[PDB]
Amino acid sequence: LSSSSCGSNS
Amino acid sequence: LSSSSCGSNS
Amino acid sequence: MERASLIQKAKLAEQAERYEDMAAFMKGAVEKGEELSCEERNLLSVAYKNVVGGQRAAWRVLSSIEQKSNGPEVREYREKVETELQGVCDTVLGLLDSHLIKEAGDAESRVFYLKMKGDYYRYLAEVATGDDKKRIIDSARSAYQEAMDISKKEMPPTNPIRLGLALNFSVFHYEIANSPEEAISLAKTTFDEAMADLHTLSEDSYKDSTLIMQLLRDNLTLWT
Amino acid sequence: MERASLIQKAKLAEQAERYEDMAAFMKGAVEKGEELSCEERNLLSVAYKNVVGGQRAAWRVLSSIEQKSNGPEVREYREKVETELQGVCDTVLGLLDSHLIKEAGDAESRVFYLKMKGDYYRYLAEVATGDDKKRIIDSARSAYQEAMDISKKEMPPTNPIRLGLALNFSVFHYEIANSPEEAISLAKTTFDEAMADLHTLSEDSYKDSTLIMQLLRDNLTLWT
Ligand SMILES: [Cl-]
Ligand SMILES: [Cl-]
Ligand SMILES: [Mg+2]
Ligand SMILES: [Mg+2]
């Protein structure tokens, strides 16, 4: 796991 | 569907 | 050279998954000095995000290898990729500062572009050292904070642009500024205040909001 | 500039999914004038196949749009992509004709490279017109046929290199040379003669063979 930014999950 | 060449299915 | 042609070709490049070309077309269109529509600003962002995304992924792979290592080949190639990435970020930031932010005629555009500025400075920060990194972090913070101020005045809490900005600023706090408490505070406030209105949202609205809010939740779970 | 460095960097580029860089490193390594190992010839092929693969996918998208159309933008951009694709194919073919085929010290290498030559001429044929297309088709056929001759003498029928060559030559016959009967004949013979030995194969051997034989079967189903 890691920090997620906007758009990273489509 | 279309003609498939070598490696096209991984 | 006509703006309409450049936009047409950006759209073709997008269908062809030619993102470097798409970015170049959009750069030429921005340089005509007229505002971008919502469709057009999204062409710009998609193009450059794909280009930098590839560089960032490559840079992380090489950096990881270089660290585990500790000949010059890995360092050299990591530096090559780094230089290229810095170049693209600097190109996007130049468009934002020479045209897009100042020429934007509405608040939503301004937030979109100031978020972009924060993002591209954040990408520079990921590879930066020394005084360069300090300057970049200050610039990222200033852009994100200005965007935050406008968004809180002009957009409702579930607005996807507002949510995406808050998300990315929280990531800046955690990953870049080494400010976990600010990151957690912002993420939690953002989620809580958006959750409060999700019951008023339509199907497609809710999905757009919930997709970003899922990332806010994922981050909080990792950070806690 | 040292060969070992170029190979090291090709391997890094591969991990980083930087295929254009990977191709450039491998080109430099080929130009040292020593043979490539099996690992190394696969680095070369993977790199260039990814680069040309992206161009081919883009070219098909633009060509389709251009056809349905029948301003100059689509044609212009299709021509730009076409020129770039021709360039890469010509680069690979130059490596094969200036170094790889003649310098290969064993039959397996020679088949691998002659197959590559057929393949890259086939990719040129997909975009070619006029006398260019005629020359290219003759060149593809000659390369594939030489490869076929060696493979039938030197490799068993389930050998994956032999199967992959036969598969790609059958595709050439069907899609490029407009010779469906030759395509079907070759595909059927290839499948039948490989099927005949699959019961002698191990788990991993069988998978490698069956994956290519599945494509032979898929093609026959489309062509019939
Ligand atoms: Cl809800
Ligand atoms: Cl069997
Ligand atoms: Mg540096
Ligand atoms: Mg032409």
Domains observed in chain D: 3-223 (1.20.190.20)
Instruction: At C90, give phi and psi (nearest 5°).
Output: -65, -35
- DSSP-based three-state secondary structure for C77: helix
Number of H helices, E strands in chain C: 10, 0
Going by beta carbons, is chain B in contact with chain D, meaning 3 or more pairs sit under 8 Å apart?
A: yes
Give the residue from chain C lying closest to D59, CA to CA. C16
Is the backbone of residue D178 left (phi > 0), alpha (psi -120 to 50) or beta? left
Burial class, C80, CB count within 10 angstroms (exposed 0-12 / middle 13-18 / buried 19+): middle
Residue D12 exposure: Cα atoms within 13 Å on the Cβ side: 28
Which residues fall within 8 angstroms of residue C95, CB to CB, at 6 or more apart?
A: C27, C30, C31, C44
- DSSP-based three-state secondary structure for D4: helix
Which amino acid appears at position C149 of this protein? D
Rounded to whole angstroms, what are the CA distances from C176 to C92, C136, C140, C214, C222? Answer: 20, 10, 10, 21, 16
CB contact under 8 A, B2 and D222: yes
- DSSP-based three-state secondary structure for D114: helix
Do D19 and D50 form a contact (C-beta atoms < 8 A)? yes
Do D193 and D183 form a contact (C-beta atoms < 8 A)? no
CB contact under 8 A, C212 and A6: yes
CB contact under 8 A, B1 and D222: yes
Residue with tokens 């607005």: C159
Which amino acid appears at position C90 of this protein? D
Report CA D92 to chain centroid distance, whole Å: 10
Q: Could you say which of B3, B7, B10 has the minimum Cβ distance to residue D219? A: B3
Rounded to whole angstroms, what are the CA distances from C218 to A6, D173, D174? Answer: 12, 53, 51
Q: How far is the CA of D148 from the centre of ligand 4 (A)?
A: 30
Do D17 and C60 form a contact (C-beta atoms < 8 A)? no
Resolution of the experimental model, in Å, one decimal:
1.6
- Tell me which of D2, D12, D60, D62 to substitute to probe the interface with C (most C C-beta atoms closer than 10 Å): D12
Q: How far is the CA of C193 from the centre of ligand 1 (A)?
A: 12
Nearest to C24 by CA among C5, C6, C3, C4: C6
Is the backbone of residue C199 left (phi > 0), alpha (psi -120 to 50) or beta? alpha
CA distance to partner chain C, nearest, from residue A5 (Å): 5
Neighbours, chain D (3 or more CB pairs < 8 A): B, C
Rounded to whole angstroms, what are the CA distances from A10 to C115, C201, C208, D17, D65? Answer: 18, 20, 10, 20, 26
Do D193 and D152 form a contact (C-beta atoms < 8 A)? no
- Tell me which of A6, A8, A9, A10 to substitute to probe the interface with C (most C C-beta atoms closer than 10 Å): A6
Q: Burial letters for C161-195: b for 16+ Cβ neighbours within 10 Å, e otherwise?
A: bbbbbbbbbbbbbbbbbebeeebbebbbebbebbb
Do D166 and D186 form a contact (C-beta atoms < 8 A)? yes
CA angle C71, D30, D112 (to 5 degrees): 125
